Amino acid sequence: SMEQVAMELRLTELTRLLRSVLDQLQDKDPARIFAQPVSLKEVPDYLDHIKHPMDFATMRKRLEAQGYKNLHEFEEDFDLIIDNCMKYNARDTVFYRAAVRLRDQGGVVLRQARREVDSIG
User: Fold this and answer.
1) In 3D, which of 98, 10, 15 has the Cα closest to residue 60?
2) In whole angstroms, what is the distance from residue 68 CA to residue 63 CA?
3) How many domains does the chain have?
4) Which of 28, 46, 74, 80 has the most beta carbons within 10 angstroms of its beta carbon?
């Protein structure tokens, strides 16, 4: 139908906007601490601690399959990256501190993204 196409064009444009959001959040991680999945070869007990692992490469795969229906779903995944790290790693670690800085800096990007998503519809 024409409606399914219109719906598909909206999803494509959301994907375009979320790709730009993702790039901007990932620049706030210059150490690439959150770029890839935590390695289960190197951290073999990880899944005993963290039930829903997440990372930027995994988000990008979902994004490029148009797997985020709305900004809320995308934010859920970003928040998993931060929150998983802050549980697994102690406060005095470069990993925890990296997550705090990513959360704080990402807040600004996500604030305007929400306005843009509502505004453009």
Assistant:
1) 15
2) 6
3) 1
4) 74
